[model samples]
Target: VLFQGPPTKKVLDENGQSINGKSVLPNATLDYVAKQNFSQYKGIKASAEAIAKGFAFVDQPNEALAELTVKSIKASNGDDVSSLLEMRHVLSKDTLDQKLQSLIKEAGISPVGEFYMWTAKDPQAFYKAYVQKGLDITYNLSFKVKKEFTKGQIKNGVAQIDFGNGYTGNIVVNDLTTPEVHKDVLDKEDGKSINNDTVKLGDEVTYKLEGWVVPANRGYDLFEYKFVDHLQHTHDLYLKDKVVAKVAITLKDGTVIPKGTNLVQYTETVYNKETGRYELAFKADFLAQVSRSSAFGADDFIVVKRIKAGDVYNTADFFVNGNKVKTETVVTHT
Candidate 1:
């Protein structure tokens, strides 16, 4: 299974400044951010079964796909792929049976193997039987396998984050190809409430961001976004916790306040009312996640969603900032 996001434009930076605020040349390419459909392959349990009367795939194969067999046959070096192709190779009737057996032996496989594995089904004969017996064989595999990645793992991989300590539970994989977000320990001073004072960037910010990196898949780790070309180009911002609320101000006077106080505001605590009202600690910290190696190629955008693995909850959506977004994968199943 795979979850694919819209293709993004790739910019070619020509200016050398991309490294040191230098000028750059620009170019564009089409790219899509997609993730392996882990859910489609995870938690799926299966086994081989024996049925006396019903028969099975071992007895049936799809003839429609026979054309694809030639490549495999030819590559087998007169072995696997050849014999299958020779079934129709015309020859003297006298040696035809011998030739057929020879073909099978040369292939080092048996008729049952042919019947079970080859979907071609004697392309010549398959048509004759198509209306009656029909090609009963199929090219489908009979076994199923499952895969899983923990929330921590997916988060780390997608987000390219190296969470400190055992902070796996605090991380989430929003997209396998994009950076994930983590909630490290915010300064207690920056926790929930604040009083007053102005703060500036680079002013001794202290806080912890926690999350784990998901292991690499197919040898690729982290979803990488290349907004600019050249190495060392990225964005860093302070983590701001957005809050939603309603404020109903009441006058100290006995005057009755309107119906209900309906108001909403977003605020950051730059200062604390306690401890001499000094700005000793404010929790905002620069956000940084290891970018995916450039070898992965730069992507325009990556989907970051909750890791479906280790989610015993069997649910697939998360609410953020009062909006419900689907975190489950969009999949195509065969």
Candidate 2:
């Protein structure tokens, strides 16, 4: 902005003479203060924009917002406006409020947005003063990933922070992205949890699978997820057909995918006569990457009609984009 704040009122020299104090430049104190909606401000650009528009300043209010306001902030270094910020524009709360209102509406700002303190005084001076001379600010933040992706490796990712209005700031990160899936077996007969890891002879078992980044959040690219389940001892156990039919897949929000859909594509079982091993495998894919934090959960059942009365195990291997990502195994004593 133009060096707009007035000059200092007075500066007395040692000789009892008035020393004219220079007006601090605009950016001498050009700092940012005030940010709202830390928790409520994250999503795809469009979704975040809707959130901004619908945000209630108070359920019903004068205004609201998730916003960043740039004004003459107290210099952390303790400078002054023509006083300290050297360049300062002091106003009543009402004037500040009016200035904000005029700029918001007249600036064609979106609901979730950013603002600065200025008005009808001079329109040509907004971007002139602070191009690249202001002090750089560092924002530190913490984020939580979905439960499924915790065990998966995240080597690349980013944080695109939308200021809600038209401005979006992002810091690219080369570390963080995980496509996780977990598998476990439960004693189906007694409905006991898998913490037991042991099953009786000729009994049923339930397999559990959940994932945080199953398809890898590929919006326009191909994201294919497949898993193969192998039995350690095929002679002691058997597979069931109903288990395949009864299997259900759901998103984190519990959105049941309709069968034969794009994401609900393939599932089947196979018998390897040479190795005498039984196998169950599933294949699915996704193109519309909605929420990366959303998880996918599935439950499948197993039965051991014929058993050898010993320790048997099951393993599930997961793959994404033709690359293996995870392998989970459960050992059960029969």
Candidate 3:
């Protein structure tokens, strides 16, 4: 999901530099178009400067290379089929099979059995549908609410969300004792035993953590790893508790856009760290525009900003604002 091009004029050589710009690849006529096999296309692992960066997915260079060009494609055990065989070689085989039966407009994937359901039964219609659908489609929103309930009652909640480095995962509830909550610190003596929210097998129901909104053509959600402790002198959690999120594709039209009839939109900022704000570590590529009017749609959203108003944009600096953007992006598979 790194082919967002709209800024050009970068092609130098003869030592003045800028030729390979630190690995976009295409130094000398793109290594004769990288060997050629097209492997019926799968997942994706192209070279030649990743198909000469910014090939204009919607414009056309023979329909963006035939979708993206393929041949011995790799990288898809989770699947996108070598970037859809390089987009069907930029789109052709019948509009790339109707753009893979409508994969949210463009970019391909999310169709094996696709999931992300919400008819909006509550939570302010699930926060207006998460700000009309922002945060790069589904940056990540979790829930475990309780104002009052009956019939089965068992209230105690946990929502330890992380996306740090090794890609963490969490969302616990009514825990009898930490049933799979990690990043350490829930102890009493350390006798060692996990996944213990104890309900064993029956009638306690009402549990949810199925939220994977990852869209914007599936570019980021780069880290989320939670699996603490395996003490063997080293790496046993496979990777432990980490939370990382990056969205600054130029702040997506700023204040997250769509302007008026409001399906959910917001902004609030504050930072002092003693006087000189200081923390501005960068990286962004965001979008989530649900609309009723003023303009923007993909419908369904919920974005909540509370900065200095109540002091919580994650504990203050909530003003800033997309494409090819990636913050703290680094997670080299162990």
C-alpha TM-scores of all predictions: 0.19, 0.37, 0.14
State which candidate, 1 or 2, has the greater TM-score.
Answer: 2
**Residues 31-76 of candidate 2: C-alpha lDDT, one tens digit per residue:** 1112112222212223333333321110100111122223332222
Candidate 2 is scored at a TM of: 0.37
Prediction RMSDs, each to the true structure:
25.4, 20.0, 27.0
Model 3: CA > 4 A from native? 1-28, 31-87, 90-94, 99-101, 104-334
Ranking by lDDT: 2, 1, 3
Local distance difference test, each candidate: 0.20, 0.34, 0.20
lDDT of 3 by residue, 1-334 (tens): 2332121122222333332212111011111111111122223433533332211111111100111122232221222223222222222323344523332223332222212211112323222222122211111111222222211212211111011001111211121111111121111112222122222221111111111222232211212211111121111111111122222121333444322222112211222323422222222212233211112111111111111111111111112111111121111111
Collision count for each candidate, in order: 36, 13, 60
How much is the lDDT of residue 330 in candidate 1? 21
Q: What is residue 269's positional error in candidate 2, in angstroms?
A: 3.5
**Top candidate when judged by lDDT against the true structure:** 2
Worst 10 residues of 2 by lDDT: 55-64
Q: Please estimate how well model 2 matches the true structure, expressed as its whole-model Cα lDDT.
A: 0.34
What root-mean-square deviation over C-alphas does model 2 reach?
Answer: 20.0
